[PDB]
Write a protein that binds this ligand. Structure first.
Ligand SMILES: C[C@@H](Oc1cc(-c2cnn(C3CCNCC3)c2)cnc1N)c1c(Cl)ccc(F)c1Cl
Length: 293
C-alpha cells in the first residue's frame, strides 16, 4: 500500500481513522467524479464518495486525497473526520461546510436591490485573509497546492461569522501520484504552464487570481478569453483589469501576485500583511460593492 509524507513523517492507509459504516447515515445530496452528501456519524459531516465503477488508479487517487487532508492541521483547511474504506462505496468524511463553495457563494450572495447589504468589502477581505492564512500554512510546510481557486474553497456558513477554508486537493494529489483542456491555466503563472515548474510562488500567482474572483464577486477570470488566449495574453505581459469598484490597495495586491518572475512575487506572510493593512484602511472598507440589478 502507498505511503504519504508530510511535515516530517510518513503515513499510510492504516493511519486513517476508519469509521464503522453502520455509524454513518446519509441525509441528502449536496450536488463530477463521485457524489457528495450531507451525513451523520451526532457529528454532522460531508461525505465524499468513490464510485464503485472506477479504475485502480481511481482507488489510489481516492486513498491519497484522504491521506493528504488527514495530515493537515490548520483552521483554514477543511478537517477530515475520518474515512470508511472497508465498505463500498468508499467514503471520505469531511467537516461539513454549510456555506458551500466560495464561487457559488459569491455569485448567489452578490448585493441586490432586495439584499443591498448582503456583503461588504470587509466580508471579502476576511475571506481573502482566511485563505491566505491557509496558504501560508501550506507554504511553511512546503506543500504546493497547484489549484488555488474559488471553486476549491468552502465556507463554514453563509452568515457573518463565516470562515473560508481550502478544501479540494485533487490537483496536488494527481501530481503526487488529466490533460491540457482540464488544466486550470487561468490560475497558473508562466513558468507553470510553460515549463511545468511549481513552487510556493505558483500558489502566490493563483492566489492573486482568487483575489480577483473574490472582489469581482464570482466572475470567471479573464472574461471572454479562452484558455489559449489567456496563455498568450499572460505570457505577453497582459493582466486583468481591476474588478468593478475594486479599491486600489486591493488591486495592487493582485498585480504583485502576478509579477512575471516568481522571485518578484510576495510570499504569503507579505500577502497577509498587505491584506491586513487593507482591512484597516477606511477608504478601502467603506467602498460600496456594485449592486447587481
Ligand atoms: C467534497 C465537497 O465537500 C463539501 C461540500 C459542502 C457543500 C456543497 N454545497 N453545499 C451547499 C448545501 C446547501 N446549502 C448551500 C451550500 C455544501 C460542504 N462541506 C464539504 N466538506 C466539496 C465541494 Cl462539493 C466543492 C468544493 C470543495 F472544495 C469541496 Cl471539499
Amino acid at each position: 500500500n502507498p505511503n504519504y509524507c508530510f511535515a516530517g513523517k510518513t503515513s499510510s492507509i492504516s493511519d486513517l481513522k476508519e469509521v464503522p459504516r453502520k455509524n454513518i447515515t446519509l441525509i441528502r445530496g449536496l450536488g463530477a467524479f463521485g457524489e457528495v452528501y450531507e451525513g451523520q456519524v451526532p457529528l454532522q459531516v460531508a461525505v465524499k464518495t468513490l464510485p464503485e465503477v472506477c479504475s485502480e488508479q481511481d482507488e489510489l487517487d481516492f486513498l491519497m486525497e484522504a491521506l493528504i487532508i488527514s495530515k493537515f492541521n490548520h483552521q483554514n483547511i477543511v478537517r477530515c473526520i475520518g474515512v470508511s474504506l472497508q465498505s463500498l462505496p468508499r467514503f471520505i468524511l469531511l467537516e461539513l461546510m454549510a456555506g458551500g463553495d466560495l464561487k457559488s457563494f459569491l455569485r448567489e450572495t452578490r448585493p441586490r436591490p432586495s439584499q443591498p447589504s448582503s456583503l461588504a468589502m470587509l466580508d471579502l477581505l476576511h475571506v481573502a485573509r482566511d485563505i491566505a492564512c491557509g496558504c501560508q500554512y501550506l507554504e511553511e510546510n512546503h506543500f504546493i497546492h497547484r489549484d488555488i481557486a474559488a471553486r476549491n474553497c468552502l465556507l463554514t456558513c453563509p452568515g457573518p461569522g463565516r470562515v473560508a477554508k481550502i478544501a479540494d486537493f485533487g490537483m496536488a494529489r494527481d501530481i503526487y501520484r488529466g490533460g491540457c483542456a482540464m488544466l486550470p491555466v487561468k490560475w497558473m503563472p508562466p513558468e507553470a504552464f510553460m515549463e511545468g515548474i511549481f513552487t510556493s510562488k505558483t500558489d502566490t500567482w493563483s492566489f492573486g487570481v482568487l483575489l480577483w474572483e473574490i472582489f469581482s464577486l464570482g466572475y470567471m477570470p479573464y472574461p471572454s478569453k479562452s484558455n489559449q488566449e489567456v496563455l498568450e495574453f499572460v505570457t505577453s505581459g497582459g493582466r486583468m483589469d481591476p474588478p468593478k469598484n475594486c479599491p486600489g490597495p486591493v488591486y495592487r495586491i493582485m498585480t504583485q501576485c502576478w509579477q512575471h518572475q516568481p522571485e518578484d512575487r510576495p510570499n504569503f506572510a507579505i500577502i497577509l500583511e498587505r491584506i491586513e493593512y487593507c482591512t484597516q484602511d477606511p477608504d478601502v472598507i467603506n467602498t460600496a460593492l456594485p449592486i447587481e440589478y
